[PDB]
Design a protein around this ligand. Structure first.
Ligand SMILES: Cc1cc2nc3c(=O)[nH]c(=O)nc-3n(C[C@H](O)[C@H](O)[C@H](O)COP(=O)(O)O)c2cc1C
Ligand SMILES: Cc1cc2nc3c(=O)[nH]c(=O)nc-3n(C[C@H](O)[C@H](O)[C@H](O)COP(=O)(O)O)c2cc1C
Ligand SMILES: [Zn+2]
Ligand SMILES: [Zn+2]
Lengths: 228, 228
């Protein structure tokens, strides 16, 4: 089995850093092939620009990012930073995203990875999405850490249920590209927690990873995210 | 009245470009004070890094972006690009976000604006969020364009209701910072539409802007976004 960890945290000594490291330790112990894309260390480009296509454009007068990257993918003219990520995804059986929640979503550096790496022709097609998605047969998992407590992330809590913010990521992005979505790993408020509680959350993730290949994906539907 | 348009599109000749320009035209005609932050033209930095603080870090051994930027805001040691955006937001009565929908969310360049500009001490505090957010008294409006049709963005459609993807932006971000949220302007599938239909969508936005100051904000709640 091959795993890609797309990691988005500035500090190796952080709780995010610890979750990424135990995932590497545990999956490596199992004999999996492991690759980590440490976005901040890579100074990963988040902006979707005309620099993402090398050589000449399909329409140089009117720049359309979607059209240009779709054509560049088919013509093998995408920037090397994008194709390097695409090769990692193409080979992966499982893609784990490790990140702190920023504004109920991914940090911009990781949003940039999604915007630029998951181009038409590679991840999805127009038309050719959801179960017609080009990353079918692959698994994806969001391992998120929050500032807010589990209680704040409930239906009647100030932030609403944690499943509400998962919709654009799990459904709009991952499911759209054909991934089977494994249940998210949500590590609530580690900064507020004790050293023992943090060790507990890190151990819970390592223990979950021991049987990750036996898991069934979630039914990635509106009912799962919002229903009763 | 003072308006800030935070604009995220690479192409001035685009439909997004047209929506931004008619907003400038109409608001300027009304006599409003108008400022546009054209993120791609500014090469706006989306990454949340240690480069966003120029002074002595509160903890140089373990970098915590949230803590460091909160302190840097209070000390006036944030990078000038952040400070420049904060001044525009501080003076604005209304903040319009003009952008194409990328993965059920904002393009990464605009996610970066939210991550870096809306720091603790400026946009919110603990306590001092949601109805007590520091941007209370201000209005915010999302003017979004999509690839998907209105029909795809319905409860029984493949993408689910359009309100579902608005939650992290409207509630998790804007309402969290104390903004009152005006109803979104969603311009569905302009690329698929005819030249006449595109003119119609641009005119509908210009027409709506004529009476924008008379609008009441939406009740930015879980019920509004998801029903029941
Ligand atoms: C720019 C920014 C935005 C944040 N937005 C949220 C948010 O929407 N919800 C939340 O619960 N925490 C939010 N947080 C807090 C982080 O999620 C939290 O600090 C992190 O998950 C802790 O993990 P770490 O100790 O490894 O950094 C935000 C933090 C920053 C810096
Ligand atoms: C990286 C990327 C991601 C996109 N994700 C979505 C999406 O989640 N939903 C959608 O309906 N359209 C999506 N689109 C299509 C754009 O929203 C659409 O092309 C744009 O709104 C059209 O406006 P414009 O002609 O001014 O660029 C995406 C486009 C790109 C380039
Ligand atoms: Zn789904
Ligand atoms: Zn709200």
């Amino acid at each position: 089995k091959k795993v890609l960890i797309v990691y988005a945290h500035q500090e190796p000594k952080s709780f995010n850093g610890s979750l990424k490291n135990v995932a590497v330790d545990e999956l490596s112990r199992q004999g999996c092939t492991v690759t980590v894309s440490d976005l901040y260390a890579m100074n990963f480009e988040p902006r979707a620009t005309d620099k993402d296509i090398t050589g000449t454009l399909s329409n140089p007068e009117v720049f359309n990012y979607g059209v240009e990257t779709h054509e560049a993918y088919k013509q093998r003219s995408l920037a090397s930073d994008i194709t390097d990520e695409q090769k990692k995804v193409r080979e992966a059986d499982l893609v784990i995203f490790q990140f702190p929640l920023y504004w109920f979503s991914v940090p911009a550096i990781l949003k940039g990875w999604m915007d630029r790496v998951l181009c038409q022709g590679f991840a999805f097609d127009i038309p050719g999405f959801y179960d017609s998605g080009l990353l079918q047969g692959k698994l994806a998992l969001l391992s998120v850490t929050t500032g807010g407590t589990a209680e704040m992330y409930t239906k009647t809590g100030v932030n609403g249920d944690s499943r509400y913010f998962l919709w654009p990521l799990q459904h709009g992005t991952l499911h759209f590209c054909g991934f089977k979505v494994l249940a998210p790993q949500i590590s609530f408020a580690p900064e507020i927690a004790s050293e023992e509680e943090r060790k507990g959350m890190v151990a819970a993730w390592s223990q979950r990873l021991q049987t990750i290949w036996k898991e069934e994906p979630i039914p990635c539907t509106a009912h799962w995210h919002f229903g009763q």
